[PDB]
């Protein structure tokens with residue numbers, strides 16, 4: 053029995069068509085090194101997505117690996133329940149609070165981003181009950197935002213693909229508009245007037261629902277999985293004014309943006325967000341270990357704290373919350389990012405990536421090139437004037453990603469946009485190779501479509 | 506400045522009184538070895554809970570540690586999205602299906618048990634939509650069952666402590682009775698007649714709600730966190746008849762019972778459960794890595810599979826689903842359990858534990874001693890006739906656990922019951938030490954309650 057046959061027999065794959073997978077089987081990844089991964093046929097790929105927007109230090113950082121070993125051989129598992137604690141969790145939490153872009157009080161650990169946001173939901177409901185505001189429970193998020201896939205976090209998520217067939221969203225989970233100018237501005241509307249209109253939509257939803265009932269607003273500084281959507285200029289400023297105006301919490305989902313992805317350490321810095329709560333994962337540990345972290349500010353903590361006392365204890369926690377190996381790896385991961393000045397380096401590499409892609413700005417199939425820092429996307433279209441897809445929406449993106457893989461590069465399509473989110477350690481010539489391989493895929497795709505003009 | 510000061514400054518602790526924690530600070534655990542952990546003052550404790558019911562191979566198994574290293578140096582992270590895969594996930598899924606106590610089709614990986622059950626809920630809703638039964642969505646679980654703490658999995662959970670202040674449970678999440686004879690049988694009622702009444706309660710709830718609306722029943726074979734509650738004889742047989750009778754899925758939550766805890770490899774074996782879906786974690790990896798697994802049978806898979814095609818792809822998955830290091834460690838973990846015959850050894854050690862605790866059956870503060878395999882609990886009461894707590898529920902359990910710690914043993918109180926769930930590798934004399942330290946805490950607690 054072959055390894056692909058076993059995979060087809062025994063695994064149900066996430067984000068995969070199960071029937072198609074029975075026919076095609078897997079692409080088996082065997083090993084990784086630097087920014088590369090290699091399949092079981094020996095073929096090498098530049099992992100331009102850093103796996104899942106996550107492997108900041110690439111796929112063979114020995115320091116992370118040794119940090120795991122050292123912790124394993126000390127204390128391979130323990131927990132944080134009932135006052136129990138341990139050094140790595142404590143030192144990681146310290147570090148996270150000291151590097152926070154706004155004053156923060158406490159860290160709560162989970163395994164995943166989905167768990168983290170699911171936990172943030174519970175925390176907010178518990179908070180407002182403590183403050184004697186039992187109706188202030190509803191969450192507002194955006195269309196195409198992604199925040200995980202638990203029943204609750206998938207209700208925060210605004211991608212239909214995460215909701216169809218799952219009876220989601222739940223009640224109490226509301227969605228306002230995707231802040232993507234290219235797709236949702238009115239013709240002749242500026243970015244600033246687009247922002248104004250989005251801020252007005254929000255105020256209108258708050259009033260229509262009853263401000264007293266709205267607990268929180270959650271957003272990725274820029275949207276990752278939904279298309280590498282940069283919000284229009286002034287979006288965050290104006291959205292925050294509306295939130296402060298109705299005493300609504302601002303939650304920044306920094307699962308992707310966190311730790312140098314957007315040109316600064318956090319997307320909250322890059323986009324001037326002053327969040328009450330932040331959510332972190334992915335680059336936190338370069339995904340070498342499953343871990344996520346929630347940062348909460350003083351008011352949120354004090355409320356939760358009072359209530360935990362009134363009720364005996366805080367009735368919430370995962371077995372793996374603050375896992376010593378995962379926290380130890382994350383701690384070392386963050387140190388490395390500081391010591392090797394990878395935020396500033398990622399910013400420089402980002403400028404190269406973007407400049408290199410922009411040689412294609414006038415290509416007949418390129419509708420928009422977007423991004424900031426070391427995250428980017430090229431959205432292809434069949435017609436630039438109408439912005440319509442070639443064939444069905446997603447056809448170009450799917451063909452490109454296929455061709456990129458053929459040319460030794462792994463990118464993810466999101467509809468007809470292809471993303472780039474390489475490891476932070478990518479070097480100058482590697483960025484060139486990424487753009488080259490993008491170009492070869494574009495060329496192939498262009499031959500295939502035959503635009504004329 | 507000091508490590509405890511940092512913890513107080515920067516960490517919000519789960520299952521902890523936050524204000525009390527600001528005053529007392531943490532108990533910092535520095536290192537582990539065998540069944541022991543040591544605090545930062547050098548003091549050693551028998552981890553009689555195996556951490557969180559989980560550390561099957563104890564706290565210094567070198568083989569798990571090497572398996573991690575070997576995987577780290579090969580491929581330290583990758584994912585299973587969009588047809589991507591990798592050896593450890595594949596080989597682990599193979600093994601899990603091989604060793605399943607009933608025929609199973611597929612494995613889906615998560616990081617946690619809470620994620621797993623939360624995922625099982627979504628899967629069942631997605632399944633029944635695929636089959637054109639859009640009303641068949643409700644879940645039935647039990648009072649005092651524990652199934653995790655996501656918004657949904659905490660609604661499956663039937664412990665009020667996980668629901669107060671969280672606006673839970675959600676609608677669609679229903680609870681029938683805790684199958685705990687000592688607390689809920691009528692005077693003079695046999696275990697079998699208790700079972701009958703519970704099976705009738707369930708049928709009645711199904712009919713009262715509309716069988717067409719009931720998707721699934723979920724249960725831990727025996728309840729862990731809710732008190733180490735062994736169901737009465739015939740409970741599972743009768744509950745299953747009721748479920749098959751209304752085409753209701755049976756989900757076995759084996760997060761604790763999995764991998765030799767109850768005397769056999771699974772609680773489903775020990776209690777004759779033939780589940781459609783199983784949920785696994787904890788001893789899966791001795792908690793050396795955060796990982797959980799869902800096993801689904803053929804019908805569940807085929808429905809989900811068709812739907813994933815209709816909708817383009819299965820719109821669900823965690824970044825860490827099937828993580829190569831966690832799956833690699835779990836794979837080695839399971840091999841070790843087989844190779845060292847720890848299921849049978851745990852069973853023997855379980856006999857010793859339970860027989861040692863039984864010397865305290867006639868103690869004035871002991872209401873019930875329960876368990877099977879290598880999981881057990883002693884429930885203290887203020888009065889044995891009435892079964893009432895001293896002072897208020899949880900006061901005795903809290904004091905015992907405190908005293909046990911003083912005597913070098915870590916146990917968890919669940920109300921006024923103290924639990925035992927030691928590593929599978931515990932040896933005979935270590936079981937004696939556990940019982941001795943239990944005894945010293947009981948003595949202290951008894952002097953404290955006093956005349």
Ligand SMILES: Cc1ncc(COP(=O)(O)O)c(CN)c1O
Pocket residue numbers: 369370371372557616617618619620651652653654725729730758759760761786
């Ligand atoms: C029976 C059971 N099910 C589910 C869970 C949830 O596990 P996790 O803590 O990994 O979310 C637990 C955790 N103690 C459990 O005991």
Ligand SMILES: *Cc1c(COP(=O)(O)O)cnc(C)c1O
Pocket residue numbers: 163164165166167198199200201272276277305306307308333822823824825
């Ligand atoms: C991928 C992602 C998540 C979910 O994290 P998991 O660890 O996959 O549950 C949450 N938020 C954002 C912004 C993400 O991109």
